[PDB]
Amino acid sequence: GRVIRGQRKGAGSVFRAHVKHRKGAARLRAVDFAERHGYIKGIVKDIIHDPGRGAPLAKVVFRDPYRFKKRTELFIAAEGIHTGQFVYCGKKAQLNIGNVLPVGTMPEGTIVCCLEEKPGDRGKLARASGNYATVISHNPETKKTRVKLPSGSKKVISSANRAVVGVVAGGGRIDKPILKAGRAYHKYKAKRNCWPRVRGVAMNPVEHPFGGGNHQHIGKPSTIRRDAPAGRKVGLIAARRTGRLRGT
RNA sequence: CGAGGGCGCACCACCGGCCCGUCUCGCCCGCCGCGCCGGGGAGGUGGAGCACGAGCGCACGUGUUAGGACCCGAAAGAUGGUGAACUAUGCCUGGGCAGGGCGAAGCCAGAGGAAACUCUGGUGGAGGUCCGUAGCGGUCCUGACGUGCAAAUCGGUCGUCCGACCUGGGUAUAGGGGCGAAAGACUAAUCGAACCAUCUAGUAGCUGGUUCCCUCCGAAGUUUCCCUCAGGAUAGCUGGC
RNA sequence: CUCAACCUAUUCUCAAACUUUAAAUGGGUAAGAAGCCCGGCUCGCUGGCGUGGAGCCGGGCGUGGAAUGCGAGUGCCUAGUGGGCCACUUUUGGUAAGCAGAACUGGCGCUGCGGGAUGAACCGAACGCCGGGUUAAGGCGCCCGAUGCCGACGCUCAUCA
RNA sequence: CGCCGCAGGUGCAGAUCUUGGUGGUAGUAGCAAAUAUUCAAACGAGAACUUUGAAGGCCGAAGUGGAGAAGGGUUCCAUGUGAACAGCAGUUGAACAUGGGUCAGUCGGUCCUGAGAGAUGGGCGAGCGCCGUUCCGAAGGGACGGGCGAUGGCCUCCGUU
RNA sequence: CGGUAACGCGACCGAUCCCGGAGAAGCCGGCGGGAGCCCCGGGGAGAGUUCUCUUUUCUUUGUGAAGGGCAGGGCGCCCUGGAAUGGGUUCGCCCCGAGAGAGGGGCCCGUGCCUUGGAAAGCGUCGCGGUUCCGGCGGCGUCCGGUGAGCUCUCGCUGGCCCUUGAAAAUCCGGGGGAGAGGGUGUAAAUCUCGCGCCGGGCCGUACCCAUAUCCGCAGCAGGUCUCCAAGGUGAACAGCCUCUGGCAUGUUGGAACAAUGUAGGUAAGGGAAGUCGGCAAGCCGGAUCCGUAACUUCGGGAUAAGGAUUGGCUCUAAGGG
RNA sequence: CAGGGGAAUCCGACUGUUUAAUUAAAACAAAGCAUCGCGAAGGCCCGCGGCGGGUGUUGACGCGAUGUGAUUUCUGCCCAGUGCUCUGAAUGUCAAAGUGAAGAAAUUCAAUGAAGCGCGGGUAAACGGCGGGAGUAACUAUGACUCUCUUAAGGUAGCCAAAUGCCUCGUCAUCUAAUUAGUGACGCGCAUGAAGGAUGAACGAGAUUCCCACUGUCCCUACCUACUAUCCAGCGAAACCACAGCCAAGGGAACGGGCUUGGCGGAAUCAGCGGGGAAAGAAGACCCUGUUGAGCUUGACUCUAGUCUGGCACGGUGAAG
RNA sequence: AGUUUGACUGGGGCGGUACACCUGUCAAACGGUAACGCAGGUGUCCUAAGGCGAGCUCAGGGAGGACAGAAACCUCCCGUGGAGCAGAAGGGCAAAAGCUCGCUUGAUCUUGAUUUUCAGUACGAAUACAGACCGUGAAAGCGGGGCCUCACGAUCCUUCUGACCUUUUGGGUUUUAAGCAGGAGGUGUCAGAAAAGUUACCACAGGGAUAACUGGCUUGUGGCGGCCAAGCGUUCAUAGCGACGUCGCUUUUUGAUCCUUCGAUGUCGGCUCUUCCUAUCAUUGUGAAGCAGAAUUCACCAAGCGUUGGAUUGUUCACCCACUAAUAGGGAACGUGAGCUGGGUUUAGACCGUCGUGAGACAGGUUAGUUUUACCCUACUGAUGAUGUGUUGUUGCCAUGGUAAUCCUGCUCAGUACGAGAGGAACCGCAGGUUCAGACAUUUGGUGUAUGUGCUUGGCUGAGGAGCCAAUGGGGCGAAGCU
Ligand SMILES: [Mg+2]
Ligand SMILES: [Mg+2]
Ligand SMILES: [Mg+2]
Ligand SMILES: [Mg+2]
Ligand SMILES: [Mg+2]
Ligand SMILES: [Mg+2]
Ligand SMILES: [Mg+2]
Ligand SMILES: [Mg+2]
Ligand SMILES: [Mg+2]
Ligand SMILES: [Mg+2]
Ligand SMILES: [Mg+2]
Ligand SMILES: [Mg+2]
Ligand SMILES: [Mg+2]
Ligand SMILES: [Mg+2]
Ligand SMILES: [Mg+2]
Ligand SMILES: [Mg+2]
Ligand SMILES: [Mg+2]
Ligand SMILES: [Mg+2]
Ligand SMILES: [Mg+2]
Ligand SMILES: [Mg+2]
Ligand SMILES: [Mg+2]
Ligand SMILES: [Mg+2]
Ligand SMILES: [Mg+2]
Ligand SMILES: [Mg+2]
Ligand SMILES: [Mg+2]
Ligand SMILES: [Mg+2]
Ligand SMILES: [Mg+2]
Ligand SMILES: [Mg+2]
Ligand SMILES: [Mg+2]
Ligand SMILES: [Mg+2]
Ligand SMILES: [Mg+2]
Ligand SMILES: [Mg+2]
Ligand SMILES: [Mg+2]
Ligand SMILES: [Mg+2]
Ligand SMILES: [Mg+2]
Ligand SMILES: [Mg+2]
Ligand SMILES: [Mg+2]
Ligand SMILES: [Mg+2]
Ligand SMILES: [Mg+2]
Ligand SMILES: [Mg+2]
Ligand SMILES: [Mg+2]
Ligand SMILES: [Mg+2]
Ligand SMILES: [Mg+2]
Ligand SMILES: [Mg+2]
Ligand SMILES: [Mg+2]
Ligand SMILES: [Mg+2]
Ligand SMILES: [Mg+2]
Ligand SMILES: [Mg+2]
Ligand SMILES: [Mg+2]
Ligand SMILES: [Mg+2]
Ligand SMILES: [Mg+2]
Ligand SMILES: [Mg+2]
Ligand SMILES: [Mg+2]
Ligand SMILES: [Mg+2]
Ligand SMILES: [Mg+2]
Ligand SMILES: [Mg+2]
Ligand SMILES: [Mg+2]
Ligand SMILES: [Mg+2]
Ligand SMILES: [Mg+2]
Ligand SMILES: [Mg+2]
Ligand SMILES: [Mg+2]
Ligand SMILES: [Mg+2]
Ligand SMILES: [Mg+2]
Ligand SMILES: [Mg+2]
Ligand SMILES: [Mg+2]
Ligand SMILES: [Mg+2]
Ligand SMILES: [Mg+2]
Ligand SMILES: [Mg+2]
Ligand SMILES: [Mg+2]
Ligand SMILES: [Mg+2]
Ligand SMILES: [Mg+2]
Ligand SMILES: [Mg+2]
Ligand SMILES: [Mg+2]
Ligand SMILES: [Mg+2]
Ligand SMILES: [Mg+2]
Ligand SMILES: [Mg+2]
Ligand SMILES: [Mg+2]
Ligand SMILES: [Mg+2]
Ligand SMILES: [Mg+2]
Ligand SMILES: [Mg+2]
Ligand SMILES: [Mg+2]
Ligand SMILES: [Mg+2]
Ligand SMILES: [Mg+2]
Ligand SMILES: [Mg+2]
Ligand SMILES: [Mg+2]
Ligand SMILES: [Mg+2]
Ligand SMILES: [Mg+2]
Ligand SMILES: [Mg+2]
Ligand SMILES: [Mg+2]
Ligand SMILES: [Mg+2]
Ligand SMILES: [Mg+2]
Ligand SMILES: [Mg+2]
Ligand SMILES: [Mg+2]
């Protein structure tokens, strides 16, 4: 009869992201005439750590083509780029790590870092550390490009979607065992209030579908239907299968 | 006074009669509408009827009932509000944590070896490291106290004491909601649904109470029916007129 | 020749759900005037018939047709109650029960009083306030009213009467 | 107040009844956590407790020391009083009464933003309103610069509009 | 305007605009500089002891801000030059042909010293006048040294940790650029972040308590309630114990006794858990030095395993420095 | 000032947290392991409402949802059941709307056929389940071996009278003089068992057993100290109270202070004491009843937010089939 | 989200249905009559098993007859029903009510009255009529279901049937709808709601109308006895026993019941402490034996005195070790929680196994889990006192009440009596111990703040000396007193 955790998470209050010390939204520069017809050269000024994010962020400085001013962008750092390096964004940019150019101008095997989901937004795909998409194929008619995402799924996008070249820095961060509840505490204190996770079977029936009983058993199939109401779909949601995954 | 005889009130029992419904049988009658028209009879039977009215209004008593309903009494339910000064959690901005033990990586030198390399002594000062203050907590005495110093305190003994550490202030989350390293814990000494006012004199087949005198009469705990078995209706038993 | 079965005549012992016979106590009815006896009339019922039955109309009969006691009939409104319990006797279940359950009458409940030392129910008796007399059941050594009778006849000795 | 009528918020021992008062308990339990007081004097009606002096002790700088924040709000400071209060007393008091006391350019607030809160535009909403905080706004009311001019005047010439 | 340069000089024209800096950053370790405190040796002044001794013991023995100069600390600043037989160097590190060592400079901080302030004040002493209660008057003094893994602040250098990287904004400044402005050689102009001078700074708070009696707990309640300063001895020590400065009167009463029962604290012959549900409670052990340490093990631990010896006082001797 | 120590068993890896005011634990958390969903027109969630809002200043090395719980070592069989999921394969049923027919119409009938459910696959680190029955070896006993039945499989590796074993104080060994305790072992185990089983250091105010040392826990009690109690001066409550207060037996609502019969009975008091007053504290929390509730659960009955699907409207312009 | 989750009931739950009916009995000779009384039955079955008429006689047995036998068919005789009538049982029935045939649809259409249960309400069932229309039989008649006693169902709603019926709202026609009368679809909790759990996280109103603990009745069961005497006892009923039977007692067992207590009597065990009982384990005094002695057994008077130390277990019980004269059994609110303890059971946390879909449950296991108050009355313990003898004191008496001692060992008797032997006593006497009691402190031990005297750490008084502080600084020895 009590609203469960997870249900309480959408209300936001105590479960909002801790964005106090975050350095800004990491985005490609907005598409303009220079990036649409030629290239624009920027210089990497600094590479900084963004709290709550495993990937480094590259502070990149460009020139405003229309007024005397310097523009500062907050790119996602592809692995290999360094300070004092020139990066080039645009259609006519070359195939180097850190450059930004449309997928349609790229060969059929190049991998990319901060890929646009739609032609004109900033980067949306393959942004977490160590991840990369791959350009699979092109359709010059209908101006489409098939790419492979870090999850292994194929996706058809516009050929004008921009991306950085290379993998995103931050390497195999998940290789190291955390080893310590304290290190997990510090890891999630920079992200959001989610970490110490109480099992549902350890709760009472009032705050969880799995709670209650004289033994800590679920008492019902942990797989739950997709159309289950909020407060009920806990466990394995719409699971096509369960078990050990021997075979693929 | 009077055997007998007569008219017989009210009322009672019975037999007839009449009115409406409805059955059965049956032959007639009426006409500015001749009809799928209208009326009539006899014999049963249903009616809270008729058969030379008794009602209406007012007052009083008793009984039943709807209402706060003889008086006091729930656990609850609903509407609208007030609280995070305690606590729970997130965030912001500050403050704080003796003295010792162990001795991680890195580094120096020496020694042994044919080499590969090994050994030895230092240096270094890591760690949700150890002993142990302040702090924080609260194991046992099932100690004290138990109309207390105290609506949870005190004594000794204890757990931890560089970290998932302790803490001030500022902020955010509000009741079927929050928050929870999860005990149904905590949410102003209140929590298996806070507090405040109202609906509300909530309902109670259940418990308690129910205020002057004398006189007369005087019970029942049984029948039948009831989601009936701590209650009713019903008949009985009672009193009054 | 023996042991069975079977039959016949006998013999022992029984029945809430067996019975020929069959009480006591018990239940119904009658013990008159709304009756009895004469004539007559009605009927669509019944019918050999003036039949049968019923109804109706007149008339005559009082020794008022057992005992005992008592004044009856009738209507309206109606409260409380709807936990009962006990005793003699009958009686079911149970080893039994101050158990559980029935029948009959009385009682307690609702009830005091005399007696049972004491006691809801046993025995006597039911109650206005008193005086005198007399009893009931029960008693009469002393408590404690009354045997302080020259009471009658026996029985009985208990170191748990 | 009696009598004849009328009308009731009309009669109390109870309700762990309501409010008020009062007993026994009972001059009882008790005034026992943190080592501790003593001598003399003064004032005074009055001294275990006030003041001064002397002595003996304690806190032992993580204090029983010296200063602040929050909170309190005059408790601060003199003088006086001895009603009540300070669970014994009091000549003392954070009590009572009468007076007095807080002085800033440079100590803070004030200013800034933080987590956050919150109007407007817009959207929703029966509605009080609430959602939202850059989102769906014609969101710059400013500027030494230059020009057009009014010469407003110590109209030379620079400030003004 | 000066210096090869780092950069310096008292100013050192300049808008819109652009760039940058400061504000503006975590925790921990180890070193070094400075101060305050503590300590040691003398010299003064005043007190204490003097039964005997003690040239003794105690107290006290200043220089604010803001300027100027000089130490001291720091520099990832410059010039010369070119290093292996590598060298320099730290407690640790670490540094170098991308320029070591060495020599010579530059800058920053300068809370330390001297100086203006400044001795006139303050303090300590010794006296003399009174203005019932004079910022009175007067004398004398306010001196010289030494130490340090000491404590506390502070400044700096260099490390470690993080799947943790430890605010923002007001506000102030520097630079780039050069639109413009100012005068015709005048005792000159625009202009000036240089020296001095003139005027002003409103509003609110400000007492006191800050707790075993000024707050909350119904109270003068053994509870709760955020901080700063922090002496001597012992000692590893902000431990415990004693003391100085400062504070207090035993925690809302006293007196007299010293029964039981209690609450708190001790001891106990011989035995040693036989008590009890159960070694509950109490007791044992304990610091430091020197030895010596098992099974097992995730090889890190176990480990202060277990077990044994020693420990005072006094008088010396060696060794460790500048 | 200032650790008693040793040998083991169980549980939890550790450090951490927890029921303020009876439970600090073996419970929660944890790293590690595993599974599930999701490529943004999305997953999960909030919201009365707005293309509103949180994750999200995010983007699969990420968010969200679960289980188990360090390391090591394994993690067996079963998809019948219930869930979940996947493609519809001629396909069964299946509402409104729409279509057709009859009728004068209301209306009736028929055709058509969305999701869902059925049918068919997958899935157990989803929930869960892992029994029987016969036959069978040259002493007997067992059954390596062969067939079956419900039906989906028959309990594998391990472990055990375990915190899980009724019988049970199981049997054997060991520890003791003596052991319902402990440890080791056995195992047809009422009713062990594999994301949890079994191990294994370190750790623990966790549960247990033994040994050394130590002692007033005890034999078996004594003495001492401080504060009380005690007496005094001052001050001064509360709980509770039908009336009260000596017993034995009787009878009685079956355990009397009162009544009956007996024993008997002497003012006012002080310090103690805990046998009685079925002492006080609280309208029993156990138990039942009530056509009194509330917290929670679920194919209980009846609904509902949200979601999936069809239809009508916004809703338009051209082509092909 | 809202609600529900029956009742009865020797507590409730589980189980049953005694919840609507029928038969026999209970039931006490009218009728009625209860319990979770006894023995049973019912929710159907039947176009005939209904209705008439006719004709037959059944069960069983005996005697016969080819196969044919203990049972196949046929015949005769006996046959009061001993068969059958659908079913449970009871009643009833013979040219019946049974069996076989023939014809049939009275199992139809109607109005009332009545009986049964009963309130004299309904339903159901039934009886006697009356009016139709029929069946059968020659007819009298008989028949409106079953030989009789059971076999079943309101309001509202639905459905069907009937009247050339009534209404359908200003009139008319036609659909439709509504009525009136009679059937049917059903309520089995059967006078008739529409209905799953859990709560140890729990709540409230109550109940001693009702369970769990004491007490009371009872005594099956437990325990302890007796009577008879078949047998056991080499023989021998009764030294000691006691089969088949039978009579009792007890309330330390467990049941049975539900009288008291639910505005609360604190619920196991242990520890502590007192008293009581005797159904006597030991000890005193005795009697009997299958009593030679020693040992043992039975019984009497008898409860004065005693009945212990431990391992395991929460245990009460149990079992073992060991000592002993003996290690008897019991009661007192299953004595004793303002006496304690809290191990157990019996709240809330948690783990396992089993059960359940789940929440949750488990006289299953395991771990952690607040034990409050006396100052009142009495009782008891001690302490003052009080009434009376004029005041007061000394010395006394004893009414009454209490009461206390206990058991063992060794020496001697005595290697004696007795006995074949092995063994093996007793009385008197002597020396000592146990348990208990009442004292006491000369001695030993304990205490020790004489704060007595040395030693000693840290600090403090300038040092010495003398001291002090550290809640008794520590430690050695220690008088007195207490013990
Ligand atoms: Mg978890
Ligand atoms: Mg839980
Ligand atoms: Mg739920
Ligand atoms: Mg569960
Ligand atoms: Mg008439
Ligand atoms: Mg009436
Ligand atoms: Mg009322
Ligand atoms: Mg409701
Ligand atoms: Mg707060
Ligand atoms: Mg640590
Ligand atoms: Mg530690
Ligand atoms: Mg306690
Ligand atoms: Mg729970
Ligand atoms: Mg009310
Ligand atoms: Mg009903
Ligand atoms: Mg009642
Ligand atoms: Mg009876
Ligand atoms: Mg009565
Ligand atoms: Mg009467
Ligand atoms: Mg009477
Ligand atoms: Mg009498
Ligand atoms: Mg008598
Ligand atoms: Mg008499
Ligand atoms: Mg007399
Ligand atoms: Mg009144
Ligand atoms: Mg009154
Ligand atoms: Mg009254
Ligand atoms: Mg007193
Ligand atoms: Mg006192
Ligand atoms: Mg001191
Ligand atoms: Mg202070
Ligand atoms: Mg006073
Ligand atoms: Mg004052
Ligand atoms: Mg005042
Ligand atoms: Mg100076
Ligand atoms: Mg150099
Ligand atoms: Mg001077
Ligand atoms: Mg001040
Ligand atoms: Mg206080
Ligand atoms: Mg208050
Ligand atoms: Mg005080
Ligand atoms: Mg004191
Ligand atoms: Mg005092
Ligand atoms: Mg001893
Ligand atoms: Mg000893
Ligand atoms: Mg023991
Ligand atoms: Mg013992
Ligand atoms: Mg202990
Ligand atoms: Mg060890
Ligand atoms: Mg743990
Ligand atoms: Mg583990
Ligand atoms: Mg805690
Ligand atoms: Mg607690
Ligand atoms: Mg605790
Ligand atoms: Mg693992
Ligand atoms: Mg996990
Ligand atoms: Mg599979
Ligand atoms: Mg379909
Ligand atoms: Mg299960
Ligand atoms: Mg196995
Ligand atoms: Mg086993
Ligand atoms: Mg076990
Ligand atoms: Mg033991
Ligand atoms: Mg074992
Ligand atoms: Mg598995
Ligand atoms: Mg008595
Ligand atoms: Mg009650
Ligand atoms: Mg209650
Ligand atoms: Mg009822
Ligand atoms: Mg409810
Ligand atoms: Mg359902
Ligand atoms: Mg009779
Ligand atoms: Mg009869
Ligand atoms: Mg015939
Ligand atoms: Mg009924
Ligand atoms: Mg009763
Ligand atoms: Mg018996
Ligand atoms: Mg014989
Ligand atoms: Mg009580
Ligand atoms: Mg009591
Ligand atoms: Mg005897
Ligand atoms: Mg005994
Ligand atoms: Mg008892
Ligand atoms: Mg008691
Ligand atoms: Mg108690
Ligand atoms: Mg316990
Ligand atoms: Mg529990
Ligand atoms: Mg505990
Ligand atoms: Mg005597
Ligand atoms: Mg005696
Ligand atoms: Mg000394
Ligand atoms: Mg000396
Ligand atoms: Mg001192």
Side-chain angles (χ1 to χ4, degrees):
Chain A
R2 160 176 279 160
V3 176
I4 78 178
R5 189 204 56 218
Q7 261 190 298
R8 291 193 289 118
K9 293 219 191 151
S13 50
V14 74
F15 300 106
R16 279 172 277 154
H18 309 156
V19 292
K20 165 68 177 188
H21 292 291
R22 301 209 189 173
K23 305 286 175 262
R27 283 170 332 165
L28 308 175
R29 63 187 305 281
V31 53
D32 70 318
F33 185 86
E35 209 162 9
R36 186 186 306 130
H37 302 259
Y39 61 88
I40 177 173
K41 174 178 85 164
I43 176 172
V44 183
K45 285 301 187 61
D46 202 11
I47 292 153
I48 47 170
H49 167 82
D50 189 70
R53 183 205 308 269
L57 296 196
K59 196 172 298 296
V60 194
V61 173
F62 295 86
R63 267 177 69 229
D64 204 339
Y66 308 113
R67 58 189 63 82
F68 190 61
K69 206 177 309 192
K70 289 279 174 55
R71 295 303 195 174
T72 302
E73 315 289 331
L74 206 59
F75 286 5
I76 278 172
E79 185 160 336
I81 75 171
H82 54 83
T83 53
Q85 176 191 309
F86 301 139
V87 301
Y88 302 81
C89 306
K91 185 183 72 173
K92 306 292 195 59
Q94 309 177 355
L95 265 192
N96 295 108
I97 307 302
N99 290 2
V100 185
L101 66 159
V103 284
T105 81
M106 278 194 266
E108 321 282 359
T110 177
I111 74 159
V112 293
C113 172
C114 187
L115 181 49
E116 280 171 7
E117 188 153 43
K118 287 291 171 52
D121 64 4
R122 328 286 198 81
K124 298 283 156 170
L125 314 174
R127 294 155 55 86
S129 73
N131 286 123
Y132 63 98
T134 312
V135 169
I136 299 160
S137 79
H138 289 304
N139 201 27
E141 62 268 10
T142 73
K143 312 183 304 317
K144 288 301 173 181
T145 297
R146 196 147 159 276
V147 304
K148 189 195 189 175
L149 294 170
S151 77
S153 88
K154 272 76 173 177
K155 207 185 175 156
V156 186
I157 47 166
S158 295
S159 284
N161 293 31
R162 293 175 288 130
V164 195
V165 185
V167 288
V168 53
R173 179 183 27 94
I174 59 157
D175 292 347
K176 195 202 212 188
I178 289 168
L179 280 190
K180 280 175 59 179
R183 301 243 181 105
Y185 163 80
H186 290 306
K187 159 187 182 70
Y188 285 121
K189 190 174 172 68
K191 291 166 162 295
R192 69 206 69 80
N193 180 30
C194 68
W195 165 56
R197 193 177 181 88
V198 172
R199 287 166 298 114
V201 290
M203 298 184 194
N204 288 298
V206 69
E207 69 259 9
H208 209 273
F210 292 179
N214 279 109
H215 303 265
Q216 272 190 7
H217 74 309
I218 304 176
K220 58 195 66 53
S222 76
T223 58
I224 190 49
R225 54 195 185 282
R226 169 73 75 193
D227 58 340
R232 182 47 184 106
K233 54 161 76 154
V234 300
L236 318 175
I237 302 172
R240 294 177 191 92
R241 58 167 311 284
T242 46
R244 174 62 204 176
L245 275 167
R246 302 222 177 284
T248 174

